[PDB]
């Protein structure tokens, strides 16, 4: 967040509705954002081999 | 017509009931100008073009 | 220092069925405070007439058809309670239906009667698709407000009323979409008061300015437990 | 689940907030700021507290 | 919070307290207006490049 | 291909608008999710399993 | 029907044999409430026999689950149709696609503490409307037998009860059609021998 | 069709003398969140009332002063100073004047008073003197108006520049200090969907609570005069 001052820029902490329910322990964790906009990973065989 | 909580879709990764959401309006929007066309009695020019 | 008081200046006509209206001049912070009691009373509390019960001849409930008529008989009775009528002097009435032929059975069909008036007459009730099929039926229109489902005034009268007597759920109220705006007004000396306007979308029915005075009505009355307390 | 999400809304912070700088007077001033429309649950100010 | 107030405090205030703050974050949860869209999920420009 | 239909129909593209509170007529602070959904009613009524 | 789709409902709906689909093509010839009678062209016409099709659909029968079944025609008095087009619909079905539900209008945020956990909140105007209501069909049965005293019979002469309860009962102790009843009515009067009491 | 149903204002509860608790009950559906949030929205932005708008002070001409003597900083002088209650009879402005010497606190009874002008508590503490060679002169403003109206807004609708010395306090005209609402459920002896309305109201001390009530309902009951019929 860039949002500008009296004089100019600085930053801040967001307000994405995303990240404000997952930092304030509401629902979710990084584990799934990393799912929702990350990439997925690595996925096991039901061997367990990967 | 109906109400639901936000807090359900990060931690599940139902993310299609998002999406469909947004594409039903679409749909419904575009029936809401041929009706209008329906009561402003407009010719069948207009109607075939849109 | 007193307030102005705002005042009904224009209403505008665009259809039959919407209207819009403009009350002015009004205070700094007026708008919103008489806007949305406006909107909350208009849309639960307007009186209204709806069709509460149905005879047709030769008909027990209506879970059966009947020969010549393409449509069974759930939907036409879900025809009829969507049918806007105007009664003039009178708390209840009574009409009759009698059609036969081919085509399409319209509200325009329904006899004749000297106070009460119907302000859609092609209102589609039923087909007939045989050329010696005919159709008869009496129809109970009464008035009121709010919503009433048919399983809680058959609890109401307790006594016996005939097999073949069809009960409809009325739902009385004749406004339908209530929006509005505050907007600057002008008036030469000051420029802090503001004009307000309300766009109003109903069945036919009613009235846009005399609805507007039984709301402004309602709420006055309902102040009277605060202007004057113990 | 909502609980959290409120209270963590309505005690986070925010730059250049409308009616940033005022000093008031105790709890009561500032709920009557904020449901007049005059200052912003996020602003910055000072007030006197026992 | 609830835990020290319960420490300090006692059993009663602490069951007043613990109601007084479900009924004031359900109001301003509900005032805020918090909702979900397509566009909040932001995925990074260099992922591209990455992979 | 949904925001291009979106626009066709003088919709917000975004999917997002700006709603009311009917209790007390103020504004909420962000823009709120509206579309159409298909919903269904399920045979578990609570008329059978009181 | 939905706004949104797969492209996959029409099969699903012809494939399962809840519809009444056309044989041979030609024009529709009577349309009623309970049947269809079509008039075949004369190509698909057989030499020998009138070429008359009759489909006479189901009203208000109960299925194995105690919904209600019910068919309603589409087409209507002087069309023409071809071979494999629709005729009727069937239970949740709407011109040839299956319709499972209705497609309402949604918000997703938090109101008031209402929609708490997986809740949902729903407007007057949705139950006033009728969009969520379905019909229940419900079967009883009275089974008559031998007793080693004598026979049980069906009557309208029971013991012990008030002449208004016997109002809806006709002469041979059965309800008429078109009742309205409620929960501890008589829908059929029966009558027992007893064997003889202690006091 | 025309007859809705009409409360009685039962239970008035007084928990101070400047704090009530008023219940209302019964009403039909919806109709407390209307009479509520009508009746919340006028206490709080339409009473008229009077209160001090700006100062005058001594030696002490900057914003970012220091005056010796007094214990607190001049900021928190101008936060004593909107405590001030004061009921002003037949005039539109008043300018009063204040000064005192000594060891102590500086109170609102040391005021040089009027006939027209009554304070509502003379222990209204207003600054604390530390020493016997202190002093300070003082000349308050007090207008009349109605609402809540800033300091900045006030500053710059206006360009009039002042000599320095004017020193600029919120307005706080409303005798309101809070006011809020809840409703619940209620049952006539049949009935079970009508409301119940409860309302927690304080004020400072210049008017009851049941006074301030009764004036916005004749306020908001006045305006409609053009339409009831």
């Keep these: 967040t860039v949002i500008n001052r009296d004089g100019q820029e600085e930053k801040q902490v967001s307000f994405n509705s995303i990240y404000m329910m997952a930092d304030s322990g509401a629902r979710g964790s990084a584990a799934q954002i990393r799912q929702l906009a990350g990439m997925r990973g690595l996925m096991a065989k039901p061997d367990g081999s990967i | 017509d109906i109400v639901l909580n936000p807090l359900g879709v990060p931690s599940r990764m139902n993310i299609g009931q998002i999406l469909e959401t947004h594409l039903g309006m679409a749909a419904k929007g575009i029936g809401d100008k041929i009706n209008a066309m329906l009561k402003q009695q407009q010719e069948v020019a207009?109607?075939?073009?849109? | 220092t007193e307030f102005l008081k705002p005042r009904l200046v224009?209403?505008?006509?665009?259809?039959?069925?919407?209207?819009?209206?403009?009350?002015?001049?009004?205070?700094?912070?007026?708008?919103?405070?008489?806007?949305?009691?406006?909107?909350?009373?208009?849309?639960?509390?307007?009186?209204?007439?709806?069709?509460?019960?149905?005879?047709?001849?030769?008909?027990?409930?209506?879970?059966?058809?009947?020969?010549?008529?393409?449509?069974?008989?759930?939907?036409?009775?879900?025809?009829?309670?969507?049918?806007?009528?105007?009664?003039?002097?009178?708390?209840?009435?009574?009409?009759?239906?009698?059609?036969?032929?081919?085509?399409?059975?319209?509200?325009?069909?329904?006899?004749?009667?000297?106070?009460?008036?119907?302000?859609?007459?092609?209102?589609?009730?039923?087909?007939?698709?045989?050329?010696?099929?005919?159709?008869?039926?009496?129809?109970?229109?009464?008035?009121?407000?709010?919503?009433?489902?048919?399983?809680?005034?058959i609890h109401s009268e307790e006594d016996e009323r005939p097999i073949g007597r069809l009960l409809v759920d009325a739902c009385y109220s004749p406004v339908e979409r209530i929006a509005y705006n505050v907007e600057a007004a002008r008036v030469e000396q000051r420029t802090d008061l503001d004009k307000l306007v309300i766009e109003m979308e109903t069945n036919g029915t009613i009235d846009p300015?005399?609805?507007?005075?039984?709301?402004?009505?309602?709420?006055?009355?309902?102040?009277?437990?605060?202007?004057?307390?113990? | 689940q909502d609980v959290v999400l409120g209270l963590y809304y309505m005690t986070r912070?925010?730059?250049?907030?409308?009616?940033?700088?005022?000093?008031?007077?105790?709890?009561?001033?500032?709920?009557?700021?904020?449901?007049?429309?005059?200052?912003?649950?996020?602003?910055?100010?000072?007030?006197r507290i026992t | 919070m609830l835990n020290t107030c319960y420490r300090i405090l006692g059993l009663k205030p602490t069951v007043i307290f613990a109601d007084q703050i479900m009924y004031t974050g359900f109001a301003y949860a509900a005032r805020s207006g918090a909702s979900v869209g397509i566009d909040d999920m932001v995925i990074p420009e260099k992922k591209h490049e990455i992979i | 291909e949904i925001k291009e239909l979106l626009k066709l129909g003088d919709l917000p593209t975004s999917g997002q608008i700006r709603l009311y509170d009917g209790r007390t007529g103020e504004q909420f602070e962000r823009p709120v999710t509206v579309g159409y959904m298909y919903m269904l009613k399920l045979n578990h009524l609570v008329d059978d399993k009181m | 029907k939905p706004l949104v789709g797969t492209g996959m409902e029409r099969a699903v709906a012809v494939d399962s044999g809840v519809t009444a689909v056309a044989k041979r093509g030609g024009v529709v010839q009577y349309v009623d409430a309970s049947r269809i009678v079509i008039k075949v062209n004369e190509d698909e016409?057989?030499?020998?026999?009138?070429?008359?099709?009759?489909?006479?659909?189901?009203?208000?029968?109960?299925?194995?689950?105690?919904?209600?079944?019910?068919?309603?025609?589409?087409?209507?008095?002087?069309?023409?149709?071809?071979?494999?087009?629709?005729?009727?619909?069937?239970?949740?079905?709407?011109?040839?696609?299956?319709?499972?539900?209705?497609?309402?209008?949604?918000?997703?945020?938090?109101?008031?503490?209402?929609?708490?956990?997986?809740?949902?909140?729903?407007?007057?105007?949705?139950?006033?409307?009728?969009?969520?209501?379905?019909?229940?069909?419900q079967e009883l049965a009275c089974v008559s037998r031998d007793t080693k005293l004598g026979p049980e019979e069906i009557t309208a002469d029971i013991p012990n009860v008030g002449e208004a309860a016997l109002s809806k009962l006709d002469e041979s102790g059965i309800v008429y059609i078109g009742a309205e009843v409620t929960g501890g009515d008589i829908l059929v009067g029966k009558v027992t021998p007893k064997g003889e009491t202690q006091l």
């Design chain 7, 45 to 137: 016409m057989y030499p020998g026999e009138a070429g008359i099709d009759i489909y006479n659909l189901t009203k208000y029968t109960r299925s194995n689950q105690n919904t209600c079944i019910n068919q309603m025609p589409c087409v209507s008095l002087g069309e023409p149709v071809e071979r494999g087009d629709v005729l009727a619909d069937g239970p949740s079905t709407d011109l040839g696609e299956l319709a499972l539900g209705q497609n309402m209008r949604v918000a997703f945020m938090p109101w008031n503490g209402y929609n708490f956990e997986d809740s949902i909140l729903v407007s007057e105007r949705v139950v006033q409307e009728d969009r969520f209501t379905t019909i229940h069909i």
């Design chain 3, 10 to 153: 224009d209403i505008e006509q665009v259809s039959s069925t919407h209207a819009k209206v403009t009350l002015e001049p009004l205070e700094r912070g007026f708008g919103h405070t008489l806007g949305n009691a406006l909107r909350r009373i208009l849309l639960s509390s307007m009186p209204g007439c709806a069709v509460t019960e149905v005879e047709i001849d030769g008909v027990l409930h209506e879970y059966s058809t009947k020969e010549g008529v393409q449509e069974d008989i759930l939907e036409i009775l879900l025809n009829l309670k969507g049918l806007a009528v105007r009664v003039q002097g009178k708390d209840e009435v009574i009409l009759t239906l009698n059609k036969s032929g081919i085509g399409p059975v319209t509200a325009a069909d329904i006899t004749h009667d000297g106070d009460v008036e119907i302000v859609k007459p092609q209102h589609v009730i039923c087909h007939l698709t045989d050329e010696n099929a005919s159709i008869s039926m009496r129809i109970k229109v009464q008035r009121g407000r709010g919503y009433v489902p048919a399983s809680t005034r």
């Design chain 3, 209 to 230: 300015e005399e609805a507007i005075r039984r709301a402004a009505t309602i709420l006055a009355e309902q102040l009277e437990a605060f202007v004057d307390l113990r």
């Design chain 2, 46 to 50: 207009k109607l075939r073009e849109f």
């Design chain 4, 13 to 47: 912070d925010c730059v250049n907030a409308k009616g940033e700088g005022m000093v008031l007077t105790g709890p009561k001033e500032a709920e009557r700021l904020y449901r007049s429309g005059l200052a912003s649950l996020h602003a910055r100010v000072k007030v």
